[PDB]
Amino acid sequence: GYGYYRTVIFSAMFGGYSLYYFNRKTFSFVMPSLVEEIPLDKDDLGFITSSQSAAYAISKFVSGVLSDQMSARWLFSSGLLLVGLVNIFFAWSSTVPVFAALWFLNGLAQGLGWPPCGKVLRKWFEPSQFGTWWAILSTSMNLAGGLGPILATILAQSYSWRSTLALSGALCVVVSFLCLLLIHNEPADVGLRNLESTLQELLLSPYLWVLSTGYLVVFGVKTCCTDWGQFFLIQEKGQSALVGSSYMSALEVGGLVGSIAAGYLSDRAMAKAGLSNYGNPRHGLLLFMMAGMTVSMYLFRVTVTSDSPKLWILVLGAVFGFSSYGPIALFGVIANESAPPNLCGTSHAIVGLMANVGGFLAGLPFSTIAKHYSWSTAFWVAEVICAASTAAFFLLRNIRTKMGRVS
Amino acid sequence: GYGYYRTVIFSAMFGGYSLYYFNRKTFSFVMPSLVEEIPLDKDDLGFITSSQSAAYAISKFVSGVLSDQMSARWLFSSGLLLVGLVNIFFAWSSTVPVFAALWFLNGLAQGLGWPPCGKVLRKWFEPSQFGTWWAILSTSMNLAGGLGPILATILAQSYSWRSTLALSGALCVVVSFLCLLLIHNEPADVGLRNLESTLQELLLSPYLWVLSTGYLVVFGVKTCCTDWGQFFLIQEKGQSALVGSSYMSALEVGGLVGSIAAGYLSDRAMAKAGLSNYGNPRHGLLLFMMAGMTVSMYLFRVTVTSDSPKLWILVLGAVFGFSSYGPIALFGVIANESAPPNLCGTSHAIVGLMANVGGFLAGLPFSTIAKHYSWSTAFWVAEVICAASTAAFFLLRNIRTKMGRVS
Incomplete structure (x- = not known):
């Protein structure tokens, strides 16, 4: 069939x-x-x-x-x-x-x-x-x-x-x-029906680089919290090591369900809408999840003390994992959808390059800011970058998303 | 006296x-x-x-x-x-x-x-x-x-x-x-009472460069609208040349009153507050005026047709001039206040350097974007830059503003 x-x-x-x-x-x-x-x-x-x-x-x-x-x-x-x-x-x-x-x-x-x-x-x-x-x-x-x-x-x-x-x-x-x-790379090899663009026309499309900087920021903030959430709970917030391990475990489980829920509910939005070439129906949940990252980092930075319960830490880990691994799957899905069909892997690799850049920016400069000023100052700088990028991507939500030529 | x-x-x-x-x-x-x-x-x-x-x-x-x-x-x-x-x-x-x-x-x-x-x-x-x-x-x-x-x-x-x-x-x-x-550079020469920091400690303070990028964006968007508002009313919006000249005149008169009102009401805020070293009481009107720039560019881009009256164009020119020459005076006032007293002219010249960078960014790339895509797309890119910077400066409104050493 x-x-x-x-x-x-x-x-x-x-x-x-x-x-x-x-x-x-x-x-x-x-x-x-x-x-x-x-x-x-x-x-x-x-x-x-x-x-x-x-x-x-x-x-x-x-x-x-x-x-x-x-x-x-x-x-x-x-x-x-x-x-x-x-x-x-x-x-x-x-x-x-x-x-x-x-x-x-x-x-x-x-x-x-x-x-x-x-x-x-x-x-x-x-x-x-x-x-x-x-x-x-x-x-x-x-x-x-x-x-x-x-x-x-x-x-x-x-x-x-x-x-x-x-x-x-x-x-x-x-x-x-x-x-x-057991794989067929397209249904034309079997006989079933399927479902003209250059790499220069990909690279000159601004949505690829809006998507690249958005995934830079989302993966950088993910890697910030994933690497240094245990350290932010140990040194700054004064939790135990078991609370940090449970925070990472709740962030991972919430991230699994966040990726799956992002894919499913974003496909529901993509099924409902889909009439125009400008904008993307997947922005209508990518933006809610980037705002979820902002709200989660804010509530985890200012409303976490040593006297806050472990259940609040698990809820913040799970909601940030939801709101963080959701957009990573969504920037993958958008860099594969909004690209031309014969140049979609290249448009996805250009965004994985910015994943590498965000991994470096979360590794060394985030630890440097945390060493010099404070831990809450560094996670707040990551919060400012994520929230300013959530605003800048809320503004840029209706640019021409279909990458490639203009027709 | x-x-x-x-x-x-x-x-x-x-x-x-x-x-x-x-x-x-x-x-x-x-x-x-x-x-x-x-x-x-x-x-x-x-x-x-x-x-x-x-x-x-x-x-x-x-x-x-x-x-x-x-x-x-x-x-x-x-x-x-x-x-x-x-x-x-x-x-x-x-x-x-x-x-x-x-x-x-x-x-x-x-x-x-x-x-x-x-x-x-x-x-x-x-x-x-x-x-x-x-x-x-x-x-x-x-x-x-x-x-x-x-x-x-x-x-x-x-x-x-x-x-x-x-x-x-x-x-x-x-x-x-x-x-x-008829000038005395300080009251110590007369006898009246007056009212230890290095340039490295200035340049390493992050508020100087938050202020520099903020004034980059505000002066760039000012120079965008000041140079190309007549062209946006002629080519795109379909107004006459007299409407564009009245738009520039209303932007200049509103900018004069915007600079004066920004200085006076910001000094009222600075007189009321002033207890902490973090934040700045002048942000509490710099942010309202940068949001005024955002609202003015939005209402001038989407709610201006050929059938919109001249009074609406004059109101948008005057409110954008208010909201635009206000923050330029405020970034001057903050780059002179938040600096150390013997290194305040240097901290102001560092922000005037970004005025030059914003003038170039409003001159050539803004005209290039307006040539390629459209005029409303270019003014919308300026709107996105101004609104994303208004968000990024609303987040960064409570960083350490007193530039120099830490004590």
Whole structure:
């Protein structure tokens, strides 16, 4: 059928991108067994994970640019096969630069996998049903991150790290051929019906860069609170470490439900509206969630004391996680929808570049401001940036969103 | 007395800075008689006035930096004497590079005059009485611009341009010695009572750069509407040229009363409040006037047709002029108040540098956006910048405003 093939292809992308994220962070999942086996420095593990982070940033960008050129099926399957071959060779490795370079090459093949999922979700799913299945295909990532330390801890208690990495790499090699056989990058290959723009016309469209600065700010404020919310509760607000861990756990669970609810309710808005070329029906919940970020950072900064209860901290974590991982899924969905259909992966990679810029701006200058002035001053600077960007994106909510040529 | 010397010194600065602005724009006031006398190109006059504009920008900055080093009395009097000597030599000039270089040197000596007025108004007037006399000392500039073409047209009908420039230069030479004799840069020279910070501690204070970007945006939007409001009424909105001229005249008259009302009501707020080091009681009307800019640009963009009456255009011009020249006087008053007392001219020159940046951003890119997309799209981009900066400055209204060291 039609929806049958949508189900089959989404199950294949779900399994493939779940194995992507599990084999993206297996070395951090099997890390305790491996540091029991071989002694490695904290700076050594930081260099390995930083090699993967640098290669994954470069490869998200390069793969988004490539995914609009060659086929998403072969690119996805090649990514999964090459990730599996990396984990096979990584289980078959003992020396440290082999770990670092092979995990760099895993970071490349992990970047090489999600813009195929974006292209296939664009070409196969209606815009009334695009954000919700984007959000479930990122819930694949969240489910891999949730079931990864559990299964890796069981396989590291039972077997070694080499046997676990070898089984996971062999599983990716098998699922790479299964995703080569169960994915069609467009319905024109089957026979079903589908659903002229240059990269210069993409880059000169101002909505891509309004979207880029918006996702810069939203991912920067997400990474600010995700990295330093425990520290803001320990040093400044005077909570315990269990309260900070519960705050992070509530932010993650609220972020999972925030991404899913953002996709579903934004597809409801996209199904209701959709007559004009200017504006975007997804702004009508992207703006409410960015205002939710503003309200959550304000109420977490001024209405949190040492005497405020743990339930208020959990509510602020959950509502900020809702209001924060919602817009990240929405800037993904908009950078894939509002783009031309043959240049949507490139328009998504341009916004992931600003994800990298926001990650750096949340890492070093936010910690510098927190070191010099105070913690509440730094989180307030992040609040001002997020609220001023919520205002600047409320103003810019009705610009020409359909990127590309003008007709 | 005390208020007697405040009256005498303010009358001397009023006469001196009125002759500053009259001898700043005498060559554009006596321009028709001079182009009847000698033939000059439009590009030639543009080069002469651009030489004065470049030298006056460089000299506003250099003189603000200098006015905190040497005395404001001798710097003011030297500026007025050197402006008078330029107009004497300019009346005694015939050839074109002599005009251009001597008017460059006038632009230098015109920049060399207002930061002495800022220093004397800081050292002599209370913060409850500082913004209103700042606004009257800029009403000196507006009165010179209002009575300048009238008196210059009368003196160009009666006498020549050489006789008019010679009388105006001789008047500046006389009033330079009268302002050397009737100004005291601080009350410590008389005997009355007055009312430790480095430039690095100025530049590292974030309120100077919040104030700089705020004045960047406010002066840029002022220069956008001041240059292109007639063009927005001619090409886009379909008004006549008389409606655009009345719009500019209503914006200028409303701007005069806006600067004066901003100074007076902001000094009322500064007199009422004043207990804390964070925030500024002048924000409590700077924000209302920046929101007045936002509301005025919105109501002038969406609620102006060809069938809207001329009275609505005059009301929008007057309310935008109010809401626009108010904040320019207020960013001057705040860059002179919130600064340390021996480094206030430098903190004001740093904000005049961003006036130059906003003038360029209103000149070329605003015209480029208006050429490519539309006129309403360009004025809407200016509206978005002004409203997003009004939001970002409403958030940043309670940062540490007292620039300098922390104690």
